[PDB]
Design a protein around this ligand. Structure first.
Ligand SMILES: O=C(O)[C@@H]1O[C@H](O)[C@H](OS(=O)(=O)O)[C@@H](O)[C@H]1O
Ligand SMILES: *[C@@H]1O[C@H](CO)[C@@H](O)[C@H](O)[C@H]1NC(C)=O
Ligand SMILES: *[C@@H]1O[C@H](CO)[C@@H](O)[C@H](O)[C@H]1NC(C)=O
Ligand SMILES: *[C@@H]1O[C@H](CO)[C@@H](O)[C@H](O)[C@H]1NC(C)=O
Ligand SMILES: *[C@@H]1O[C@H](CO)[C@@H](O)[C@H](O)[C@H]1NC(C)=O
Ligand SMILES: *[C@@H]1O[C@H](CO)[C@@H](O)[C@H](O)[C@H]1NC(C)=O
Ligand SMILES: *[C@@H]1O[C@H](CO)[C@@H](O)[C@H](O)[C@H]1NC(C)=O
Ligand SMILES: *[C@@H]1O[C@H](CO)[C@@H](O)[C@H](O)[C@H]1NC(C)=O
Ligand SMILES: *[C@@H]1O[C@H](CO)[C@@H](O)[C@H](O)[C@H]1NC(C)=O
Ligand SMILES: *[C@@H]1O[C@H](CO)[C@@H](O)[C@H](O)[C@H]1NC(C)=O
Ligand SMILES: *[C@@H]1O[C@H](CO)[C@@H](O)[C@H](O)[C@H]1NC(C)=O
Ligand SMILES: *[C@@H]1O[C@H](CO)[C@@H](O)[C@H](O)[C@H]1NC(C)=O
Ligand SMILES: *[C@@H]1O[C@H](CO)[C@@H](O)[C@H](O)[C@H]1NC(C)=O
Ligand SMILES: *[C@@H]1O[C@H](CO)[C@@H](O)[C@H](O)[C@H]1NC(C)=O
Ligand SMILES: *[C@@H]1O[C@H](CO)[C@@H](O)[C@H](O)[C@H]1NC(C)=O
Ligand SMILES: *[C@@H]1O[C@H](CO)[C@@H](O)[C@H](O)[C@H]1NC(C)=O
Lengths: 412, 319, 249, 97, 48
């Protein structure tokens, strides 16, 4: 591994770095609140003739537990476009509040439910949030809403004067006042009333059929949980590196018993790092501290490849005294970290390959680690009337290499 | 690399491979800083390698060096000043996002032994322990050889060596209170400690950033967006997160250059303030410099410069 | 009516997270420090109907023994034309009715509230907000603090029953107002009032003429400002500092 | 040769940013090293101007031991100094006064 | 920070807040050099 990092077949000596320890998780526990009541999504799906686009039927779905099978009860799905959330994974995630809206429109207006566009619906009549964290569900219902006599009973406010803000009701008298004269609603001309009859008969073009369009809107990253697909509430574990799922947000780490306080309405544990580290049990009142599994950092100690091949491995900040999969010849517990593959000694020698915290390794036919030898212990005989005067010299010559300049470079 | 930029997601690490070779330069730069910060303390302290020991009877003249000599009473062998300095100078949240702190090679037990070595040599062998083999020399006689370096004759010390001992000892007794009077003196070291601490803190907080994406967290965006549209949100998350790391490493590079510039000054000052007696003005204290005594400190060194300043002047007529 | 200054009131939990001995800065609706809190007539005899506008939240504080103040009205027009909100703190169970009632100029549930318009889209039953009543202590015992915020169709109210014995207007101190319930409806609020409770006890004799337009509740408003606060090791909010006050702050 | 104008720009532009950022990083790192290489080069000039042209009384600057003189030697992108120093070797002790 | 990146437009300043804490470290960086450049002249000239 060290050779691969260095991009060479010979490594000289010293410490080296590789990928971290990365203790793998054992399994995943997914704890859900406790609510088992069936949520009535069929009411907003296949009721009687729904209202037109001029007056939507907004609903507030909450406190229930719901899944994605009852939505899949309907085959003729046409406008299955899903925004924000992928359709295949609308399960096992907890929203905070889901708003369901229903209306009936024609074929040429189905594509108008997309945000950031101008159309018949997207004009003054209806406005929708251009971020649109939710999704759109629609299917053909030309066999039910359509009538042989002609469904002229549905209107639509196309010609209203002012624009519209997203998520705003538009149901009013809407007198028409346009042109360079006050019509007052009686004059006659320039009335062009916005309301008009759709015209729904079972003999028409493909792009002019009635549909049941239900749009869903919601948001995420909220402490309370409202509605999510069922998942078996497996018993929790302690001190085991496990994946977890607590009403939405997931993560990997060990769970520890309560040591903090929290408040009756308080259930999160965000810290200065702004990462969740203390959560409450969704089922009962248990405070759990979330400390993700201990990261590593693997360091390889090697003498010369031209000298030997045996190596030693160092894990910085990882205790062993411990969850290290398989062990080796020996295990040491330096303050720097966990060292394996090297044999500690009792002597002291000059440092040649650094390890940390006053310890270095060396190659004796084996790799040995030791403390520091600062130098030979010398005691100088200091006396009130004693002096030592030299009687001979030694004219030595020493080098000293200092860089002066580096190669000049240019670019274009 | 990925541990900081992303999580346990292979797709995010796959998208980081598009950048490809940004890690190898980033990890190399920080390792170069650490390996040279580790070496940086070597020449400042390990100026002499003979580990001298003070004589059992600490009679270095009438001078009182108990305030600077290591005391065996403490579990860690340190002087009166060093223990005061240890207490006068004062994490996990960083250590789950990718950051670590490699321990220094030289612990304080050996660092204090290095200072004890120099201190023993600067007292028993005076300034000889920096030129060759140490040669003992009485401390009363050593002073008369430091006065001569300032154009003051031998006998000036000897007729009032009792006053010299009474006065240097009094000054060394006061330096404990003066250093303990306020914490403004240690501001040169507490500056480097919290500045690195706040540099790490401002790096951890940068992960919780809405860098043009729907959310800062990584796991949720996988469960939210499909492949054809999740990348356009996660890519701008990678660019910003990489930029924050790139900014941090550069700021460390300037700081590392500045720290070693001061460390070289300390090494040069350690190499002649105590190993000798400099004729340079103000380099080794204020006034005519006599000697100095090193004292270790967290992430730094402290020098107790001993100088000679005239005080009582009577003006005469000359020719 | 009368004007009174609120010193360090209107501090509440802005989110649902727990922090220990840290300093957190947040930006949202907050009652500014040292603001003009409208203190109404400090008697009770008295029966007034002040037109109170609702805008960007309302801080409501009013200590009162025997819980004479029980009701609460919200809305914009209150003539069964648009949606409205109502609270009854029936002192063993709280009832919340977001409906379209009719309401008189001088409402009074005891010795005549709506008499018509009784159909809507909300029913609620929970533990009453007020604690217990019939406290005839000579000195003041408890103080009530309430904050309402109608945003994102997520009508939130916060409460704080605290014991004070100082008998002089608002206590000078920081209060850790705590949220208790969230009501997602989505309504339009611009005006609000409240209701009292008192029995003549007999219809023939002196039915209703004893009252003048002088009915005492503190009303404060909220402004969007940054109010970096401080936590302790238990997690209860200790002190908060306003970032829009004097430059020292 | 692959993409048309309206959609080739969205790809080359991010290639432009990455190639420019790599150049910015290289130049920035050169600035720190160039400042560092001058820091030692100023020391070499000071050492050359004082160890070689004179006898420095400061200790440990012009070698190890009591310094006598120095002889400069050239080297690729650097300089080499041969510090000739005087160190004592044979130490008989005596009683002093 | 904002004055330089954007004019008197609130929407641009709201965009800057998405980065959050990028300008903070810029002001602190310029304050450190400025406070140290006034300290250079002190130790060069105020020696007596
Ligand atoms: O309950 C809801 O969520 C709906 O919110 C919107 C309507 O606003 S309104 O102005 O019309 O009242 C309400 O009547 C209803
Ligand atoms: C709606 O769907 C349910 C699901 O089975 C069915 O029982 C019911 O009859 C349907 N109602 C109408 C009006 O189609
Ligand atoms: C869920 O609620 C029921 C109430 O019927 C209760 O009996 C049960 O204990 C709750 N779940 C847990 C895990 O306590
Ligand atoms: C490796 O060792 C052999 C034998 O000692 C020697 O001939 C060769 O030059 C060495 N190579 C290196 C790169 O050290
Ligand atoms: C590892 O854990 C053991 C047992 O708690 C402890 O004695 C030892 O000091 C620990 N090692 C480190 C480096 O903290
Ligand atoms: C030296 O050997 C003794 C005898 O077993 C042992 O107790 C001691 O820990 C050893 N010292 C070191 C530093 O390993
Ligand atoms: C020097 O004299 C002092 C008393 O003044 C005495 O304590 C000390 O032991 C003497 N030292 C030696 C080495 O004789
Ligand atoms: C001094 O040492 C040298 C060897 O370095 C030796 O040749 C010479 O004889 C010595 N001088 C004396 C006086 O012993
Ligand atoms: C040196 O000073 C210390 C502290 O003032 C004192 O305790 C000690 O006795 C002194 N030494 C002598 C020899 O007086
Ligand atoms: C200096 O000495 C002279 C006599 O030589 C005397 O007159 C004078 O007052 C003294 N002080 C000053 C400041 O000149
Ligand atoms: C409160 O209103 C009064 C009456 O206008 C005014 O004099 C006073 O300055 C106001 N104080 C505050 C804090 O708004
Ligand atoms: C008041 O509360 C009691 C107990 O919950 C209930 O029986 C009664 O009907 C309530 N009265 C009203 C008007 O809601
Ligand atoms: C409730 O009142 C509203 C407003 O007057 C009215 O439109 C609606 O039909 C009423 N509902 C019932 C069930 O009477
Ligand atoms: C709320 O009512 C006021 C007063 O009629 C009106 O101006 C405002 O537009 C209304 N807001 C909404 C969201 O309906
Ligand atoms: C609550 O905080 C106070 C102030 O820090 C402290 O004295 C008290 O012990 C704490 N109570 C706990 C931790 O339950
Ligand atoms: C120093 O010389 C003396 C003789 O004067 C002798 O006794 C002693 O052993 C020598 N060495 C030391 C370390 O004192």
């Amino acid at each position: 591994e060290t050779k691969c990092t260095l991009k060479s077949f010979t490594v000289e000596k010293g410490i080296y770095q590789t990928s971290n320890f990365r203790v793998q998780p054992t399994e995943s526990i997914v704890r859900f609140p406790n609510i088992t009541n069936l949520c009535p999504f069929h009411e907003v799906f296949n009721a009687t003739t729904f209202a037109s686009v001029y007056a939507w039927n907004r609903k507030r779905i909450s406190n229930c537990v719901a899944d994605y099978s009852v939505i899949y009860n309907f085959a003729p799905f046409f406008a299955f476009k899903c925004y924000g959330v992928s359709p295949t994974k609308l399960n096992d995630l907890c929203f905070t509040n889901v708003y369901a809206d229903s209306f009936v429109i024609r074929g040429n207006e189905v594509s108008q439910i997309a945000p950031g566009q101008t159309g018949n619906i997207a004009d003054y009549n209806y406005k929708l949030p251009d971020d649109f964290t939710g999704c759109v569900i629609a299917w053909n219902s030309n066999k039910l809403d359509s009538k042989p006599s002609g469904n002229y009973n549905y209107l639509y406010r196309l010609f209203r004067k002012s624009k519209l803000k997203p998520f705003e009701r538009d149901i009013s008298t809407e007198i028409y006042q346009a042109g360079n004269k006050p019509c007052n609603g009686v004059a006659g001309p320039n009335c062009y009333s916005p309301l008009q009859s759709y015209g729904f008969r079972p003999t028409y073009g493909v792009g002019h059929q009635p549909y049941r369009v239900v749009v869903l809107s919601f948001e995420l990253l909220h402490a309370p949980a409202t509605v999510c697909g069922p998942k078996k509430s497996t018993n929790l574990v302690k001190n085991k590196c496990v994946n977890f799922n607590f009403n939405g947000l997931t993560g990997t780490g060990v769970l520890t018993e309560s040591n903090k306080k929290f408040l009756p309405f308080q259930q999160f544990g965000r810290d200065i790092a702004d990462t969740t580290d203390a959560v409450r049990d969704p089922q009962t009142l248990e405070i759990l501290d979330i400390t993700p599994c201990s990261f590593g950092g693997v360091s390889v100690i090697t003498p010369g490849t031209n000298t030997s091949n045996q190596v030693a491995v160092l894990y910085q900040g990882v205790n062993c005294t411990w969850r290290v999969y398989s062990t080796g010849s020996n295990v040491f517990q330096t303050r720097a970290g966990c060292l394996i593959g090297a044999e500690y000694v009792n002597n002291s020698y000059e440092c040649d390959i650094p390890i940390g915290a006053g310890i270095c390794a060396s190659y004796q036919q084996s790799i040995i680690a030791y403390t520091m030898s600062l130098g030979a212990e010398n005691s100088v005989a200091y006396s009130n009337n004693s002096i030592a005067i030299p009687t001979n010299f030694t004219i030595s010559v020493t080098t000293e290499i200092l860089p002066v300049s580096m190669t000049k470079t240019s670019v274009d | 690399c990925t541990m900081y930029i992303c999580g346990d997601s292979t797709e995010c690490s796959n998208l980081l491979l598009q950048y490809g070779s940004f890690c190898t330069q980033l990890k190399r730069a920080l390792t170069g800083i650490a390996v040279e910060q580790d070496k940086n303390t070597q020449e400042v302290f390990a100026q002499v390698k003979q580990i001298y020991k003070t004589p059992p009877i600490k009679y270095f003249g009438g001078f009182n060096f108990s305030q600077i000599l290591p005391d065996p009473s403490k579990p860690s062998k340190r002087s009166f000043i060093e223990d005061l300095l240890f207490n006068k100078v004062t994490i996990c949240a960083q250590k789950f996002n990718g950051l670590t702190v490699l321990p220094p090679l030289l612990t304080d037990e050996m660092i204090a032994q290095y200072t004890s070595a120099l201190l023993a040599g600067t007292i028993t062998s005076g300034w000889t322990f920096g030129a060759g083999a140490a040669l003992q020399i009485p401390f009363a006689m050593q002073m008369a050889y430091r006065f001569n370096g300032i154009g003051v004759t031998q006998n000036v010390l000897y007729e009032n060596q009792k006053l010299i001992a009474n006065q240097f000892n009094s000054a060394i007794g006061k330096i404990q209170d003066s250093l303990s009077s306020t914490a403004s003196a240690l501001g040169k070291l507490q500056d480097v400690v919290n500045h690195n601490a706040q540099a790490l803190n401002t790096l951890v907080k940068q992960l919780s950033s809405k860098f043009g994406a729907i959310s800062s967290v990584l796991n949720d965006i996988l469960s939210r967006l499909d492949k054809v549209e999740a990348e356009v949100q996660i890519d701008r998350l990678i660019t910003g997160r990489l930029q924050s790391l790139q900014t941090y490493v550069t700021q460390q590079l300037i700081r590392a250059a500045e720290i070693r510039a001061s460390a070289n000054l300390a090494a040069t000052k350690m190499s002649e303030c105590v190993l000798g007696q400099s004729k340079r003005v103000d380099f080794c204290g204020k006034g005519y410099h006599l000697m100095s005594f090193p004292q270790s400190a967290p992430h730094g060194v402290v020098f107790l410069h001993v100088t000679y300043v005239p005080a009582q002047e009577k003006n005469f007529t000359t020719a | 009516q009368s004007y009174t200054n609120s010193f360090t009131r209107g501090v509440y939990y802005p989110d649902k997270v727990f922090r220990s001995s840290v300093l957190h800065s947040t930006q949202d609706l907050f009652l500014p420090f040292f603001s003009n809190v409208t203190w109404f007539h400090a008697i009770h005899k008295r029966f007034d109907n002040p037109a109170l506008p609702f805008n960007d939240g309302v801080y409501f504080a009013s200590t009162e023994k025997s819980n004479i103040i029980r009701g609460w009205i919200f809305g914009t027009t209150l003539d069964s034309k648009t949606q409205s909100l109502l609270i009854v703190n029936n002192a063993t169970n709280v009832v919340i009715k977001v409906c379209e009632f009719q309401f008189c100029n001088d409402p009074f549930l005891d010795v005549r509230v709506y008499s018509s318009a009784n159909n809507c889209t909300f029913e609620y039953v929970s533990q009453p907000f007020l604690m217990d009543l019939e406290g005839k202590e000579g000195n003041f015992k408890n103080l009530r603090e309430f904050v309402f915020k109608n945003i994102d169709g997520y009508f939130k109210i916060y409460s704080k029953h605290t014991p004070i014995n100082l008998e002089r207007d608002l206590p000078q101190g920081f209060s850790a107002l705590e949220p208790l319930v969230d009501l997602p409806i989505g309504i339009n609020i611009t005006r609000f009032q409240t209701l009292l409770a008192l029995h003549s006890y007999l219809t023939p004799v002196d039915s209703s003429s004893g009252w003048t337009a002088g009915a005492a509740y503190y009303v404060g408003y909220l402004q969007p400002r940054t109010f970096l606060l401080k936590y302790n090791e238990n997690g209860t909010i200790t002190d908060a500092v306003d970032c829009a006050l004097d430059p020292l702050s």
